[PDB]
Design a protein around this ligand. Sequence first.
Ligand SMILES: N[C@@H](CCC(=O)O)C(=O)O
Ligand SMILES: N[C@@H](CCC(=O)O)C(=O)O
Ligand SMILES: [Cl-]
Ligand code: NA
Ligand code: NA
Lengths: 249, 248
Amino acid sequence: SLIVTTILEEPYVLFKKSDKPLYGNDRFEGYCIDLLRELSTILGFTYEIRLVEDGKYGAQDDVNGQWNGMVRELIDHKADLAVAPLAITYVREKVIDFSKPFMTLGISILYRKGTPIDSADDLAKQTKIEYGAVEDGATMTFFKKSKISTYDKMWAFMSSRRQSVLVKSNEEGIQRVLTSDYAFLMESTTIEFVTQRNCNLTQIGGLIDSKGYGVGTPMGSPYRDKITIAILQLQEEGKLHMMKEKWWR
Amino acid sequence: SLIVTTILEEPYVLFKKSDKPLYGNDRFEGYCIDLLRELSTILGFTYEIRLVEDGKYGAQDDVNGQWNGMVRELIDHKADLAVAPLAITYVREKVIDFSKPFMTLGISILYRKGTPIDSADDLAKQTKIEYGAVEDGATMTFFKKSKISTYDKMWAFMSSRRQSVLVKSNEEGIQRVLTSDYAFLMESTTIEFVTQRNCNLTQIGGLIDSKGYGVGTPMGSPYRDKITIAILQLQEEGKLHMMKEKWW
Ligand SMILES: N[C@@H](CCC(=O)O)C(=O)O
Ligand SMILES: N[C@@H](CCC(=O)O)C(=O)O
Ligand SMILES: [Cl-]
Ligand code: NA
Ligand code: NA
């Protein structure tokens, strides 16, 4: 059986609700759990889902250049696959492999409706409304590495207030938007899930970039290209779209 | 130096307009030519651009299983790369390799404005308005293979009328929409180029599927993963976005 690392993130991966105790893979449900099941149907592998220990997606540390999160688990061969909303990025592709994308997305802004804020630039040009992102994720890394003035300014702001504006999880960021004057830089796919359930919230502006979620594998894994082929089949059959419809309702 | 196969298709690849006759790589410009130039800078290769001889993207003969177009050029190792609006598909990924996508898109419908036609289903349930797609491309292949009722029905319509409703190129299909009661199934990226320039035309409905364009290589090529990393570099620095804005 393949060891599959993943992370709790609605509506991709969550704990299934039952009146009775649940065990093994049956504990989990969500878009990525359905994806994993479909991949196993096509490719014929068995698997064991395990939540990532540190609860992080994956980032490289400045000083010791060590990785954390699901990325680290693949690097160290503690997992065979990462099936999660894991963004395919330049720096990650240098240390792990990824299937082709099963979903495409971009960074955008989650905030309230009816305000004068209409873009990242509007946030960058002020300090009254705090804004931030998930710590040690692809969104934070985008801002940290950007040479675009607007985003460079936004990183300077977030970095100098790390403790107060960066959050541990999307759920924490979403809660901050709901309970304080705060705008959250996060992925558009997940924004769509939030805005269909919270009618006072909206995406602000467009997509700031473009990226895909892919299944992660250790570098050189033979499963990478097989999973790509299975994803392409599921897309063309209309199955990924049905799965998106099911979980984003 | 690498041999790069490609295909004429606005605004991805076109012949540069000029008074002085042009030679070799100078003959070409477009989104995909800019992409090729950026990839060459990052990876440090030189290249010769050659248009695909048979003028096709690539499909498999369903009797003997032989391929044509750019896909065939890669299979036969007649080109090192295909840099073009070449859709990454299940059937192609089994015979060639692709970089990760530099652009994402989906099949949709090009038609005229002001009608009650709002979806593929609306087209499928009638015959007065003819519809078709490019022969031997990914869009046609999607319909040919689909188990989805509506799309299976549309394939029955298109295949039975192959001579009259399938076209050799996007340009031919677009001209048909402009000059007759015809709706053209084509890729949303290319629709966007067209509707920005022809105000009487519009996309009908949403995306019917989702796919990306990738740089093609022969199976097992070491350039594949290198080009993926270069594409990710270009995306992250904002260049792919600037490239699309320039050509659209
Ligand atoms: N999906 C992101 C985490 C969330 C975010 O950074 O917005 C990643 O793969 O790192
Ligand atoms: N871009 C398509 C051709 C055009 C189409 O099929 O709509 C391909 O790669 O085959
Ligand atoms: Cl790949
Ligand atoms: Na890699
Ligand atoms: Na392949």
